[PDB]
Amino acid sequence: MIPGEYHVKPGQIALNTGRATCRVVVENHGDRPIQVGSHYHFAEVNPALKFDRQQAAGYRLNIPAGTAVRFEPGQKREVELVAFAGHRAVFGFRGEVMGPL
Amino acid sequence: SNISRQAYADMFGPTVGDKVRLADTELWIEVEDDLTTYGEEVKFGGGKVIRDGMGQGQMLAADCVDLVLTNALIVDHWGIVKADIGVKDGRIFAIGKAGNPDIQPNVTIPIGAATEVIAAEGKIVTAGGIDTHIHWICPQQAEEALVSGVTTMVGGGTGPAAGTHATTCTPGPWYISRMLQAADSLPVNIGLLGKGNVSQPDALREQVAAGVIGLKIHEDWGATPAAIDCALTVADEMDIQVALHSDTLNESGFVEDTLAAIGGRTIHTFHTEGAGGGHAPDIITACAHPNILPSSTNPTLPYTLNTIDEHLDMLMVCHHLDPDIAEDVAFAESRIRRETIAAEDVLHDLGAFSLTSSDSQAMGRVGEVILRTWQVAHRMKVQRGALAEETGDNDNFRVKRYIAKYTINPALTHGIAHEVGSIEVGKLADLVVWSPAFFGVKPATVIKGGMIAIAPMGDINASIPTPQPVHYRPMFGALGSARHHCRLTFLSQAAAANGVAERLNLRSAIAVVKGCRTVQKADMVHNSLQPNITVDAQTYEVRVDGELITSEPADVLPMAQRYFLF
Amino acid sequence: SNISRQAYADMFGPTVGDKVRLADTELWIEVEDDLTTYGEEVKFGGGKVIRDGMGQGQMLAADCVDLVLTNALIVDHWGIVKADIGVKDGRIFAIGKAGNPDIQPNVTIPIGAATEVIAAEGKIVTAGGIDTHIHWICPQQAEEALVSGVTTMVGGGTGPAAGTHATTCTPGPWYISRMLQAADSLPVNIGLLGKGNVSQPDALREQVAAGVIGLKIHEDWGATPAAIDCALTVADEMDIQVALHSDTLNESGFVEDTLAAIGGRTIHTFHTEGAGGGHAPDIITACAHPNILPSSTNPTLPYTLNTIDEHLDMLMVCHHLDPDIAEDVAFAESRIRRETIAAEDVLHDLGAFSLTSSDSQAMGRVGEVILRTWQVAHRMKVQRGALAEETGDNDNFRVKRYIAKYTINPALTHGIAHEVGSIEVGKLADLVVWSPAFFGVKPATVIKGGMIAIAPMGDINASIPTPQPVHYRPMFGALGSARHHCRLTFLSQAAAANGVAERLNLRSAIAVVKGCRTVQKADMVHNSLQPNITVDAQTYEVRVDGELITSEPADVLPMAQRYFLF
Amino acid sequence: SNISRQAYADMFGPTVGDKVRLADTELWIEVEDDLTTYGEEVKFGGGKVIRDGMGQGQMLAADCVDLVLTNALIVDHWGIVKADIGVKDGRIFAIGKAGNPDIQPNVTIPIGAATEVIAAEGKIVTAGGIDTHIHWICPQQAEEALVSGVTTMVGGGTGPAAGTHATTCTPGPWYISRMLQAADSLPVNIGLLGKGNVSQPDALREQVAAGVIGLKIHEDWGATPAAIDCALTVADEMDIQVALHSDTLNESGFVEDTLAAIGGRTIHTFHTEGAGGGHAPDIITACAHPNILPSSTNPTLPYTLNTIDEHLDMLMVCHHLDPDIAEDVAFAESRIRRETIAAEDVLHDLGAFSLTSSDSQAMGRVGEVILRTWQVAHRMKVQRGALAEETGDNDNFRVKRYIAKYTINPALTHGIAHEVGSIEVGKLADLVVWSPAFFGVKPATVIKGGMIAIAPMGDINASIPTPQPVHYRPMFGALGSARHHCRLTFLSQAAAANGVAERLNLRSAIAVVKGCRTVQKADMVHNSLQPNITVDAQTYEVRVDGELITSEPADVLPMAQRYFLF
Amino acid sequence: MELTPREKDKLLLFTAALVAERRLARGLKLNYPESVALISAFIMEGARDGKSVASLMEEGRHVLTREQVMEGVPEMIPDIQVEATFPDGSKLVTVHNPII
Amino acid sequence: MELTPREKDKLLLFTAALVAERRLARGLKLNYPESVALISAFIMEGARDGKSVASLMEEGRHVLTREQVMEGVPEMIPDIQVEATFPDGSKLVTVHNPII
């Protein structure tokens, strides 16, 4: 008997189903580590990460909400992206779009 | 991508189909629905979702909520669902999916610069409780009650004076005025009751005109047919409630006479079982009527091994009875009946008793209304199994029936359900956050009108708020003007019209009561049964449709020795 | 029918001719009169008298009292009688027979729907005490004092600052204004004293115009003939009191010079014995004058075995004296005289000393003014027997003489006797309820302006208010606006006229002082003696009419180790 | 006549050339000047100087001070001198020679009937501290801080909600309004910060228009170049300060990018070392810029033996990080660097870091801002000896440099230096009195706006205020209306113009902020260094001009186990 | 811990009892407040132990005797009442004339 | 003494621990609040003694075992945190899964 215990039925949960995704190889050319969040507009990440920014426009990481992907200096790794929804309007980050797209 | 359900529950709390044990009881709830969009849940922290341009938008204050409770598991009379809760202007704005419409789908609760967040993932959220049987013997009762999860307190008194020790009456315009003024200092919603024991109507009308939202008829003040009738008449005119504690001595008549005086008009019966008061020994037969809104006080909930021994002296002290005086003790004794005390628990489970309350420091415990309600639910699941209404392998319906008892039902019965009583849009943000391991025992957060009023708080000088010693301390919601703005003083329509708030210079928000005469047994959420109940004049056996109603005394209960230091 | 006196006293408290021991002292009081009509006493509870149509009437609020204290044994300067007390509008309405004129005889205090009740049968009821020698060193003093039964506190200060540590002065308009504002937060009646040590009159007039009800002349500020004279002159103009603590050093002259400065004008002398201050060693000779209203501070009441040892260091710390500095210690020592300390107790018994006060945290104990007054009464009964005024086998007169010392006399001396000071109709309802076993030690109820302000209260979550731990907790009478409405801030006539209350936005009820210049020794209730007293310049022997006045030090006192945990 | 210096120091405190040890540290201060006239010092007590016609004059209130602090040893950024302090109207009137011009020479601070006195001889007097990094997690923080000597608290929050647990933001107009109202109940000066993490300017402008004096940019809300830029733009328009906690993840860029966003505009950087937050691992390089006003939080001051072990979990709880989640812990770990933690202490000693603050209950201790500042000063004297600026055999300059860190510098940085921040004429009388043996640990008196607000107080019922148990208790300065009059609520110029105080019905005195955009590193009193500092990307070594900056961890510190019960 | 007001209040009862406990151990005759605190704390530990209300109503009369307390104390205490969490929730224990 | 609020607050922790200490001595299985108070007070005395934070983070897991506490208690306490004055100022001690 455990006070307030959960009884979670086994199985998996499919995240961000139905949306466009795309893979991209990212390489950290910086000398310090960089860590990206699940909803950050990827195309505007730290300029030290080298990748095809054009393909990642309007995309974010296809990872469970709240989690993150880390890149140590010099690291190269392929990540999966998923397209932004709602109004698909981007405001903030590095201030590159600041409107729809 | 894909995530296993277990790790999912660890981050965002349980989802549809997952079950959670309520504290250390045998009651289990099952998530019936989740209003989220998997992968788009909002979460706060470094690198998380709620950040400028991401989970947070660019909207002005007027277009976003002030506070958002992320990933909460709501437990209310209407459902047990997982969702985000949005609060705006001290009131519940919406129950759904929070986030940024700019980049997220199905956002109904917008988050912006003006949005504060309370992380409720892994927590059960409920409306604040409502106790309609308070004796204002001391101001200290409000904190005790608030700490346990009760956000509204209705009752009466002037302090530690004989009258109040025994009855919930705030005698006269002067005392009423005084208590309305003192109420601004309390961190809970308040509404007073006047002394309704009088045969001249104008003496009651002044009290209602002075501020009370109801009239208490107590046998200690003389619960006679004439008095009862007078109060109900004024009640019908002014749209206020009448709470009754009938004639135990059978001095002016029996239960059927009191019932005849009542004349089929709406009335709220206190401790309908009778150990706390009422015609001996069958005042419990009242719950079979359509105009009766029956409630129980808490010392008898649930039937345990020490209940009877403890009751005799408790009774003597409260009503100012002399143990040496024979008739004072014969009376005291005729009130305590193992038979009715046992039947009461079942009647609650069947939905024949619609309310639970304390009867603070007068045969009741102010910080145990919620705790005891669940102890009865547990004991009934253990003794009788699932209810006829249940579906699936959970106790969801039993929980909805029991939660309604100290939330929505007390609110409908006293005509304040339009302001409080449950988690529905437009209602005041009186919410309670609980860790599942402490459900109904000790709360994580108590929110009054959109502001945290009291919460567990560790070392004030520590580097984080979690180091010991952790104990409940008042928060900003309970400070000066912030409190006034976050609490309600319930007035009668006559008083609100007369400018009582202006004359007394009351500072808190004002609410008015209405719909006290129209409520009936049928309106009590999940607790609207009217059984053909009988009580034997000598054996005191309670019978419904002939079948015997009874239960066995518990020797050990959950939500007890595992949580309290004393 | 017929009832034996013993069972009678058990239900309704003692009646005429019955005696009651005051706490654990040797003092006995005897009921001199009972204003009831045997068989028609009002009592509250289930089946009792106070019920609709019976002991309670059908009258509107305007025609009945708000609160009634049933079957009380009143102890005041005018009598020791059994009666019902009626309170209306925060003031004493009547002292007589409560009930329903409809069915009861001789009802003078009508009870109705608007009437709240406090059961005082078996209890002694007194007016709230008045301490006129407070040092506002900390706000915490008000609670300590209120808990002991003192409802009015007069004195001065700005907090824990040197000036206030030694003197009862609230320096200047700014500080005065500030303290008047802070006073609204205290649950006691308050009146401030300004620093009266100045030779320029206009500097005093502003202080009186700013709000003070009196001027304190303290040697630490320079108690010179010129200063004394200036203060008394302003006093005579503005109708305020002057409290003096004379020149112990004999620096500007001797007692006869200070007395010459006083010029026969009305003045209240602090610690007239002198251990607390005043011309060394015969400032006590003052009590022989008609314009002198003499009071004692409490550390020396009564003369016990540890009194002298304890005094030296107490003196050093209060007045900021340096123990290394010779003259600072010679001074300190000339102030403590076993001879005068012994004479003082007798002088109180003879009625030569009219007041008792604390001198809070400055050679006085704020929660012991009442307690020590009775300890002297007990020690004097034990040492000298009955007074010449006594009649019957009781100590009634000695009790009336001693009670007057911390109630009516302090009230007349400071010109507030029109509002408080005793249990008489029209006065503010500042009352204290006591169980006879704890008389003068720990109160059952402390009522401020008709509302219970502080009382012993047990477990807040218990089923009754009696379970342990029971300790004093604030009540509604002490909460926010209810407090403002139940307390008085005494102003000077100039200040009340100038609109000081409006400008400072003070919220509490306002009273004005008057009749400070007209009082004389002859006006001190039961304490108006003017003896031909002398003090020997070297032996310090006190003599009245030649006979030696002295007493022996007590080794054990009542109202001590039997009641306190520490 | 003539008096030896030793006996002189015993009566009037030390004079020119005398040295005093600060608590139990190795720091020594030397009196640089004495503004008295030997033989004419004012002293209070029986027979002393401050008496009518002597040390006290015949002047009206308007021509004398309200309170005088006699013989104080002032320790401030401008000097360490002995003098009398005069206070009038809640503000510092003068710093010089008090007395009576009638009979004394060079009197600049007149004493009269309206003058109250605080004897400060033998005591060190300082201005009240200012903490600009408060998280309003609980109202209890104000007392803790006040007791330690901090009289002004700037920061933000709504209570124990996730947002506030991690960030110092008071989200939106509603919460801002609510906190401004609740602030009147606190006995300290307060100014709020809004959530500045937004890319749309109007969302920030409302917050400033609603009442905040600054905007906090926190990475948990998204510290992106776009957000940073937006906030600084609004800041420049409205004359408010921006406090930053940068992007530790390097998610949107590195320190040089954040610095580029800042664009050379004025900004206050929080925990510039980085253990508390900021670009990993060289956010410390910021202190080399002219527009950067760098401060440290307190858990890392000074570098001791347990610092590192204690940090990991402290970090996890504050920012809501999941220890199971790898990236949440890698992050948590990259933040804690022994190298930067060591360099920080030196940088403070060199004057490269200008401020010290708490970061209350979010990786900071509210009652230890002052205490830890001196512990660093001590550890640096011990490790590095005298500063290049020192003169004579004392640590006077090091003390002036360190005191400025929690007094004048925090005040200039937030645009409130015109009201508080130091002991200069015209400023609010927020002063702290200390016995030299407890300097920086436990205060003798804490004065708010000319009224003692909190102080150590012994037995309330004792004959003197010194008997045990002695612990800090609230004074009159902290009661109701006296508090409102003695505290300030800092508003933004827009809010003060919009009538926010009138609309919210705030009762306390109001001050407005200004000069937040004009301050630069050069303006930080005694802490204006801009060093060519570098940090190694892997070794994390901090270097200034190439030379290595580092220090050794202390195993035992003063102001610790000798003063605290726990 | 999450101590509620009622738990913190009882901490006062417990501490007061520690005071009385030591004095009794020195052989002093206890006074009014010491006696009440001492007998009261006993009952609370009784509940923690799981004893019944009926049992404690009896055991509570054997903590102190007329010979261990100050004169007049036994008559100053007609009854003692305390509430504690028993295995089956909170219950009120009333000990009549505890000292004889 | 000049006790600050934080010192007086810890007095509550200490007193609560005295309560748990006695019950454990009677052989009772401690509950949630007793367990937290007991392990917590231990750590505070550890600092007074001068032991290091690292040491206490380890010693704190050996105060009580799964067999000395009530069922469900160990899982109701994932960690315990207390702050005390060490020879080198105040420090936070965090004991993870103290009961096993």
Domain boundaries, chain B: 1-127+422-479, 128-421+480-566
Please provide residue C109's backbone torsions phi and psi, each rounded to the nearest 5 degrees: -120, 90
For residue D217, give the 3-state DSSP assignment. Answer: strand
The neighbouring-strand residues paired with C193 are C214
The domain limits of chain A are 1-101
Contacts of E2 in chain B (CB under 8 A): 438, 442, 456, 470-472
Which positions of B make up the binding site for substrate?
A: 218
CA distance C448 to chain B (A): 12
CA distance D564 to E13: 26
Of C119, C466, C479, the CB nearest to B162: C119
- Give the residue numbers of D marked as catalytic: 319
DSSP B283: G
Beta strands in B157-247 (DSSP E): 189-195, 214-218, 241-245
Residue entry with tokens 């001050």: D511
Contacts of E1 in chain F (CB under 8 A): 16, 32-33, 36-37
Residue C308's alpha-carbon distances to C53, C288, C336, C337, C474, in angstroms, are: 63, 26, 7, 8, 37
Question: Choosing among D249, D259, D320, D324, which should be mutated to test the A contact, i.e. which has the most A CBs within 10 A?
Answer: D249
Distance, CA of B212 to chain centre:
19
Residue B262's alpha-carbon distances to B273, B523, C403, in angstroms, are: 18, 19, 53
CA distance C58 to B224: 14
- Whether chain E lies against chain B with 3 or more Cβ pairs closer than 8 A is yes
Beta strands in C11-128 (DSSP E): 19-21, 28-30, 33-34, 67-76, 79-88, 91-96, 98-99, 109-110, 116-119, 124-127
Going by C-alpha positions, the residue among B330, A33, B516 that lies closest to residue D537 is: A33
CATH number assigned to the domain covering D128-421+480-566: 3.20.20.140
CA distance D215 to D207: 9
Q: Containing H/E element for D313?
A: helix D307-318
CA distance E13 to D565: 23
- Cβ of residue F10 closer than 8 Å to a chain B Cβ: yes
What does this entry list as its resolution, in Å? 2.3
Q: Containing H/E element for D404?
A: helix D396-404
CB contact (8 A) between residue C463 and residue E92:
yes
Q: Which residues contact D156 (CB under 8 A, 6 or more apart)?
A: D134, D135, D136, D164, D167, D168, D169, D170, D179, D192, D193, D194, D195, D212, D216
CA distance B295 to F67: 42
Q: Which residues contact D4 (CB under 8 A, 6 or more apart)?
A: none
B449, B151 Cβ separation under 8 angstroms = no
For residue D99, give the 3-state DSSP assignment. Answer: strand
Of D226, D251, D282, the CB nearest to A45: D251
Longest dimension (CA), chain A: 55
Which positions of B make up the binding site for Ni(2+)?
A: 133, 135, 216, 245, 271, 359
Contacts of A1 in chain F (CB under 8 A): 71-72
- Cβ of residue C459 closer than 8 Å to a chain E Cβ: yes
CA distance C476 to B7: 52
Q: Which chains touch B (3 or more CB pairs under 8 A)?
A: A, C, D, E, F
Name the amino acid, one letter, at B356. Answer: T
CA distance D297 to D141: 16
Angle in degrees, CA D335, D340, D344, rounded to 5? 125
CA distance B181 to C449: 15
Q: Out of 2.30.180.10, 3.90.1300.10, 2.10.150.10, 3.40.50.360, which CATH number does the structure's domain A1-101 have?
A: 2.10.150.10
DSSP structure string for C192-234: EEEE---S-THHHHHHHHHT-SEEEEEGGG---HHHHHHHHHH
Which chain C residue lies closest to E74 (C-alpha atoms)? C562
DSSP structure string for D418-430: TTSSSS-TTSB--
Residue entry with tokens 């706390």: B276
- Cβ of residue F64 closer than 8 Å to a chain B Cβ: no
A99 CB neighbour count, 10 Å cutoff: 8
Which positions of D make up the binding site for Ni(2+)?
A: 133, 135, 216, 245, 271, 359
Going by C-alpha positions, the residue among C13, D182, B153, B105 that lies closest to residue A87 is: B105
CA distance D239 to D91: 25
Domains in chain F: ranges and CATH: 1-100 (3.30.280.10)
CA distance E26 to A80: 78
Which pair of tokens denotes residue D401? 């440099």
F19, F37 Cβ separation under 8 angstroms = yes
Pairing of strands A68-71, A34-37: antiparallel
Size of interface C-E (CB pairs under 8 A): 63
Size of interface A-B (CB pairs under 8 A): 147
- Cβ of residue F8 closer than 8 Å to a chain B Cβ: no
Identify whether D323 is preceded by a cis peptide bond (ω within 30 of 0): no
- Give the total residue count for chain A: 101
- Whether chain E lies against chain D with 3 or more Cβ pairs closer than 8 A is no
Distance, CA of B45 to chain centre:
34
Longest dimension (CA), chain E: 42
Q: Which chains touch F (3 or more CB pairs under 8 A)?
A: A, B, D, E
For residue B503, give the 3-state DSSP assignment. Answer: helix
Distance, CA of B272 to chain centre:
17
Residue entry with tokens 């009261």: E40
CA distance B521 to C44: 34
Residue B496 burial by Cβ neighbours in a 10 Å radius (0-12, 13-18, 19+):
middle
Q: Which residues contact D346 (CB under 8 A, 6 or more apart)?
A: D380, D384, D549, D550, D551
**Residue B320 backbone class (left: φ over 0; alpha: ψ -120 to 50; beta: rest):** left
- Whether chain D lies against chain A with 3 or more Cβ pairs closer than 8 A is yes
CB contact (8 A) between residue A94 and residue D252:
yes
Name the amino acid, one letter, at F98. Answer: P
CA distance B121 to chain D (A): 12
C411, C117 Cβ separation under 8 angstroms = no
Going by C-alpha positions, the residue among E24, E29, D275, E57 that lies closest to residue C562 is: E29
Residue D407's alpha-carbon distances to D151, D269, D354, in angstroms, are: 10, 17, 11
Distance, CA of D328 to chain centre:
33
Residue entry with tokens 């346990």: B148
CA distance C306 to C293: 29
Produce one character per residue of B56-87: b if its CB has 16 or more CB atoms within 10 Å, e if not.
bbbbbbeebbbbbbbbbbbbbbeebbbbbbbb
Which chain D residue lies closest to F52 (C-alpha atoms)? D306
Instruction: Give me the helix-helix angle, B307-318 and B338-350, nearest 10°.
Output: 100
C536 CB neighbour count, 10 Å cutoff: 12
Which chain D residue lies closest to A39 (C-alpha atoms)? D222
Going by C-alpha positions, the residue among D92, D35, D116 that lies closest to residue D431 is: D92
Domain B1-127+422-479 is found in CATH 2.30.40.10: yes
C122 CB neighbour count, 10 Å cutoff: 18
Which pair of tokens denotes residue C495? 């200040």
Which chain F residue lies closest to E14 (C-alpha atoms)? F19
Residue E38's alpha-carbon distances to C461, E91, F25, in angstroms, are: 21, 19, 19
Q: Containing H/E element for C328?
A: helix C326-334
- Cβ of residue E91 closer than 8 Å to a chain B Cβ: yes
DSSP structure string for C301-321: SS-BSSHHHHHHHHHHHHTT-
B286, B259 Cβ separation under 8 angstroms = yes
Of F10, F57, F90, the CB nearest to D365: F90
Instruction: Give me the helix-helix angle, B396-404 and B369-384, nearest 10°.
Output: 140
Q: What is the CA radius of gyration of chain F?
A: 13
Residue B360's alpha-carbon distances to B139, B298, B363, in angstroms, are: 12, 9, 7
CA distance E72 to chain C (A): 8
Q: Containing H/E element for D237?
A: helix D225-238
CA distance C3 to C12: 12
Q: Which residues contact D235 (CB under 8 A, 6 or more apart)?
A: D214, D215, D241, D242, D265, D266, D516, D517
The neighbouring-strand residues paired with D241 are D214
Identify whether C281 is preceded by a cis peptide bond (ω within 30 of 0): yes
Which pair of tokens denotes residue B243? 């709470």
Q: What is the CA radius of gyration of chain D?
A: 24
Alpha helices in B355-491 (DSSP H): 369-384, 396-404, 408-413, 480-486
Which positions of D make up the binding site?
A: 133, 135, 216, 218, 245, 271, 359
Alpha helices in B199-306 (DSSP H): 202-210, 225-238, 255-262
Written in H, E and C, the secondary structure of F59-95 is HHHHCCCCCCECCCHHHHCCEEEEEEEECCEEEEEEE
D184, D215 Cβ separation under 8 angstroms = no
The neighbouring-strand residues paired with C76 are C79
CB contact (8 A) between residue C320 and residue D451:
no
Contacts of A5 in chain F (CB under 8 A): 75
Residue B524's alpha-carbon distances to B262, B354, B530, C275, in angstroms, are: 20, 6, 11, 73
Produce one character per residue of D18-40: b if its CB has 16 or more CB atoms within 10 Å, e if not.
bebebbbbebebbbeebbbeeeb
Q: Exactly one of C77, C268, C279, C319 is catalytic; name it.
A: C319
Which chain B residue lies closest to A83 (C-alpha atoms)? B103
The answer for D 223-252 residues in CB contact with F (under 8 A) is none
